[PDB]
Amino acid sequence: VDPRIQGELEKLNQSTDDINRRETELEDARQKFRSVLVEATVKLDELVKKIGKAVEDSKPYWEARRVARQAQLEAQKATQDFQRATEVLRAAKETISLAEQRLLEDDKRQFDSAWQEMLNHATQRVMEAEQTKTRSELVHKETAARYNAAMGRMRQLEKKLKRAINKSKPYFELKAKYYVQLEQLKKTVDDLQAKLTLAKGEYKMALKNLEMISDEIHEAAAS
């Protein structure tokens, strides 16, 4: 079948054009990343020569400042898992206390039967709550000191070698301005790269049809 093959032919040649285009789109994306990279580093290395020793002496603090953020997020879990534990205890205390008012009387006729299932659950609820409470109230304590020690150490390392930290300030800033630029560029290249392989992938997929179509037209030929 001649009409069967010519249609498939047009498709593969359109793919090769699209791929050839997208390859060149990456080339401009690749070399521009190469260019920005080397351009970035001649600036940062120049800063090193300006102020070298201070930056080295500054790194004990910045690593400690990193720990400051990490020690904090330990507390963020501790305080909130404790806040939840206190609320669960209160809501269960409420469920019990409201039941307790109707529990002293036992005079409720139609109400007492309804109440007791609620009470028995709540009394079994507090069994679980107080334990997660005591666990969380201690976790609240563990992270807290580390958070105080981290600040205390940061503060101690703040007050010590301030001079070192002052001179290193511009270095980490151009480091940060380039860092956020590169992270954005990598994603542009990486996502284009993925889009390449899907195109080169669907191109290989289109050729497999030809093998099958040649195989398929072969059966018709035998007749």
Author numbering: 41 to 263
Paper text:
The Rab11 subfamily plays important roles in specific trafficking events such as exocytosis, endosomal recycling, and cytokinesis. SH3BP5 and SH3BP5-like (SH3BP5L) proteins have recently been found to serve as guanine nucleotide exchange factors (GEF) for Rab11. SH3BP5 exhibits a V-shaped structure comprising two coiled coils. The coiled coil composed of α1, and α4 is solely responsible for the Rab11a binding and GEF activity.
Because computational secondary structure prediction assigned the N- and C-terminal regions as mostly disordered regions, we selected the central helical region for crystallography. We found that the R260A/R261A/R262A triple mutation reduced the degradation and obtained diffraction-quality crystals. This construct of SH3BP5 (41–266; R260A/R261A/R262A) is hereafter referred to as SH3BP5-RA. Finally, we determined the crystal structures of SeMet SH3BP5-RA/M167A in two different crystal forms (I41 and P41) and native SH3BP5-RA at 3.35, 3.6, and 3.8 Å resolutions, respectively. The asymmetric units of the I41 and P41 crystals contain one and two SH3BP5 molecules, respectively. Therefore, we obtained five different apo-SH3BP5 structures in total (i.e., one from I41 SeMet SH3BP5-RA/M167A, two from P41 SeMet SH3BP5-RA/M167A, and two from P41 native SH3BP5-RA). Although these five apo-SH3BP5 structures exhibit a similar V-shaped conformation, the superposition of these five apo-SH3BP5 structures using α1 as the reference shows some flexibility of the conformation. The hinge region of the V shape contains staggered hydrophobic interactions so as to maintain the V shape.
